[PDB]
Amino acid sequence: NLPPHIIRLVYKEVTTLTADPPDGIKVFPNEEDLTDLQVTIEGPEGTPYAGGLFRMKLLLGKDFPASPPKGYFLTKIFHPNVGANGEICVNVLKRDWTAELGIRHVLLTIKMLLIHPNPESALNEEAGRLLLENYEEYAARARLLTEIHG
């Protein structure tokens, strides 16, 4: 139940964003509810997630864009910043957020997160500790779950 003038702004972003998304990212056409966007993020090459295709959904909350969107991975993944429910915690984004950044910036931030995790704010503390204490162990399991779910 976003304000109509906000919906009018969302339709603009999504329409442009869908016709020309960032690399490795694809926003699916939404004509039902643009508050609930469906997106795929290709696992970056040179990362454990490489080769995998990760389905996610971006939810625009009630106080959007005053507050940042809330992302959720549908694809199961081993990442310090992704919870069991798939909830994505982008600590830096939520701090450096304003209404002008746009949905494109959010998706980019999530892609950058697969490359540059943040164990200082881990929803998956196991993946958080492993990333710091034994990266090779993290890369192994992350690469394994990417072969199965990616």
Author numbering: 7 to 156
What did the published study say regarding this structure?
To study the Ube2S-donor ubiquitin interaction by X-ray crystallography we stably linked the active site cysteine residue of Ube2S to an engineered cysteine at the C-terminus of ubiquitin by a disulfide bond. To obtain a homogeneous disulfide-linked conjugate, we utilized a single-cysteine containing variant of Ube2S, in which the second cysteine residue, Cys 118, had been substituted by methionine. There are four Ube2S-ubiquitin conjugates in the asymmetric unit. Within each conjugate (in cis) only few contacts are formed between Ube2S and the donor ubiquitin (interface area ~ 180 Å2), resulting in an open configuration. The hydrophobic surface patch on the globular core of ubiquitin, centered about Leu 8, Ile 44, and Val 70, instead forms an interface with a neighboring E2 molecule in trans. This interface resembles the one seen in the closed NMR-derived docked complex. Notably, an ion pair between Glu 51 of Ube2S and Lys 6 of the donor ubiquitin that the docked model had predicted and that was functionally verified in charge-swap experiments is also present in the crystal structure. While the contacting surfaces in both models are quite similar in their residue composition and size (~ 590 Å2 in the crystal structure versus ~ 510 Å2 in the docked model), the donor ubiquitin molecules are pivoted by ~ 40° with respect to each other. In line with our analysis of the crystallographic lattice contacts, this indicates that the interface between Ube2S and ubiquitin that we observed in the crystal structure in trans is not dominated by other lattice contacts with neighboring molecules, but represents a low-energy state, independent of the crystal environment.
In the course of the ubiquitination cascade, ubiquitin is passed from a ubiquitin activating enzyme (E1) to a ubiquitin conjugating enzyme (E2), and finally to a target protein, as catalyzed by a ubiquitin ligase (E3). In this paper we analyze the interaction between a particular E2 enzyme, Ube2S, and a ubiquitin molecule that is covalently linked to the E2 active site. Together with its cognate E3 enzyme, the human anaphase-promoting complex/cyclosome (APC/C), Ube2S forms Lys 11-linked ubiquitin chains on mitotic regulators to trigger their proteasomal degradation. Ube2S has an inherent specificity for the formation of Lys 11-linkages, even in the absence of the APC/C. Nevertheless, the interactions between Ube2S and its ubiquitin substrates are weak and at the limit of direct experimental detection. The critical step in the formation of ubiquitin linkages is a nucleophilic substitution reaction, in which the ε-amino group of a lysine residue (or the N-terminal amino group) of an “acceptor” ubiquitin molecule attacks the C-terminal carboxyl group of a “donor” ubiquitin that is linked through a thioester bond to the active site cysteine of the E2 enzyme.
